[PDB]
């Protein structure tokens, strides 16, 4: 329905251990399709999804050079940020940037975004109007000046409203059989004794995509979520995700509890019980 | 496809 492309950049300075490290990953929704690591022996842009490899050398050599330059710019940024705060030379510091485009169901750019952090702190962000920036402190205001002189915003509006949307539509078509094929979760309920009169009911959800999901436990049909245990949604290591939700019930009252699941691939919600 | 090359901070 509503898709998006996202890039994540990380640069970490490691004084006395080489030049800063630069990593970049690209996602289409929850599916990573590109990776670049500046520490690899052959640093190049490598495909991570089977719907981008058929692009040809022109496309991949263009990303490699793109990333190799970006890693040099981030090394400049680390020195500049360091100098803005009068930070020691023997300290390790982190720069992060995240940008992408949300392709609304209308098939057009619903919104673009670009934000950065320094040492885990919001530094500078591109505003929703794609025309200006919002700066956290006085150091980010120096950065804003430099980007304003460079017309950086005009280049981001052109990228987010054009290239970003244009290639997101291209990726979705090439990988329609997976990016647009939602996958419902495989579910079941397990039983584990706690005490002589206590038992745990764990509701499992396995092998679904995208990761968005909701698991709910109900006794008698109410929202018995004050004593429910939820683990963060987690990856299976192959494109699908996992998630379970547990509740401690008095032994003998198992069939009083029902597990409710909500996922995009499920036409109507699924109520699941524990089969002894 | 990624942004070409950002300006330095």
């Amino acid at each position: 329905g509503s898709h998006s492309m996202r890039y994540f950049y990380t640069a970490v300075s490691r004084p006395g251990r080489g030049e800063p490290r630069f990593i970049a990953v690209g996602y289409v929704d929850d599916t990573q399709f590109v990776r670049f690591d500046s520490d690899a022996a052959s640093p190049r842009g490598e495909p991570r999804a089977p719907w981008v490899e058929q692009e040809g050398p022109e496309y991949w050599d263009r990303e490699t050079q793109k990333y190799k330059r970006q890693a040099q710019a981030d090394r400049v940024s680390l020195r500049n940020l360091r100098g803005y705060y009068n930070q020691s030379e023997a300290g390790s510091h982190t720069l992060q940037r995240m940008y992408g485009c949300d392709l609304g169901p209308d098939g057009r750019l619903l919104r673009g975004y670009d934000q950065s952090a320094y040492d885990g702190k919001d530094y500078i962000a591109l505003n929703e109007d794609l025309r200006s920036w919002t700066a956290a402190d006085t150091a980010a205001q120096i950065t804003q000046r430099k980007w304003e002189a460079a017309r950086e915003a005009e280049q981001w509006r052109a990228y987010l409203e054009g290239t970003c949307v244009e290639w997101l539509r291209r990726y979705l078509e090439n990988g329609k059989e997976t990016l647009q094929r939602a996958e419902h979760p495989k579910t079941h309920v397990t039983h584990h004794p706690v005490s002589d009169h206590e038992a745990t009911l764990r509701c499992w959800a396995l092998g679904f995509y995208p990761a968005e999901i909701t698991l709910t436990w109900q006794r008698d049909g109410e929202d018995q979520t004050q004593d429910t245990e939820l683990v963060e949604t987690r990856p299976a290591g192959d494109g699908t995700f996992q998630k379970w939700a547990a509740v401690v019930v008095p032994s003998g009252e198992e069939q009083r509890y029902t597990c409710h699941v909500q996922h995009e691939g499920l036409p109507e919600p699924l109520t699941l019980r524990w089969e002894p | 496809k990624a942004y070409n090359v950002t300006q330095a901070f």
Partner: T-cell receptor
Framework: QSLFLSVREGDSSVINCTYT??????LYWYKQEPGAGLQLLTY?????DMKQDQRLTVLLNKKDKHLSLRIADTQTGDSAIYFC??????????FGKGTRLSVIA | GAGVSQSPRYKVAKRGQDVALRCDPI?????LFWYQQALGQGPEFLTY????????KSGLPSDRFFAERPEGSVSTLKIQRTQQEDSAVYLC??????????????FGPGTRLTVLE
């Protein structure tokens, strides 16, 4: 001087080129006279259709990746080599093949 | 000649000797570019700088070429064991910050380097 174009004084000249990357955010026109350096003529933002400044008119046509420069009332001082250039982000200009414009007096 | 300066302008060098080319960009400009140019052909990329950092040097055709920019102002392109194939014009350009449309930019007059036997 990969291509050649001859125009009469007082007429109009039209230079064309097909740039490479459709993601180019700015298209440029430079002219180089014999022995001199490159002179910036104009630039157009890739989201605009056309731009004008004095006797110069730039026409952009994305998808086809076609850029055109029209010199109005072309005069002998216009004889030179004209180059297409594209740029996206914080990268160097990428220049196309040149076109030598020869004005017949 | 108001703008960027390039020192040698014209240079003759015999096959084997070394040569150094100098570029004097506008004081405030952050980025600086080096190009190569053959007889009436489009300029080709060599390398460019962000302040004093070299963002890319893939354009250099041989390891004998070495550009640098110590304190982010003057730039120098050195060539060792110059060959006949090195004969060409070497252009320098500087801009306030990147080359986006409307940002101040200047190309240098260039330096024609003839390598003679």
């Amino acid at each position: 001087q990969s291509l050649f174009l001859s125009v009469r004084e007082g007429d109009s000249s039209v230079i064309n080129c097909t740039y490479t990357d459709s993601s180019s955010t700015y298209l440029y026109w430079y002219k180089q006279e014999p022995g001199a350096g490159l002179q910036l003529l104009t630039y157009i933002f890739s989201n605009m259709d056309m731009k004008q400044d004095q006797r110069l008119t730039v026409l952009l046509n994305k998808k086809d990746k076609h850029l055109s420069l029209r010199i109005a009332d072309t005069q002998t001082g216009d004889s030179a080599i004209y180059f297409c250039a594209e740029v996206e982000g914080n990268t160097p200009l990428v220049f196309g093949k040149g076109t030598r414009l020869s004005v017949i007096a | 000649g108001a703008g960027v300066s390039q020192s040698p302008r014209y240079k003759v060098a015999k096959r084997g000797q070394d040569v150094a080319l100098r570029c004097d960009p506008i004081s405030g400009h952050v980025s600086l570019f080096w190009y190569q140019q053959a007889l009436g052909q489009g300029p080709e990329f060599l390398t460019y700088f962000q302040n004093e950092a070299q963002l890319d040097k893939s354009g250099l055709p041989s390891d004998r070429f070495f550009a640098e920019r110590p304190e982010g102002s003057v730039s120098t392109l050195k060539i060792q064991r110059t060959q006949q194939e090195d004969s060409a014009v070497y252009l320098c350009a500087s801009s306030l910050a990147g080359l986006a449309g409307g940002v101040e930019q200047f190309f240098g007059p260039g330096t024609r380097l003839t390598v003679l036997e």
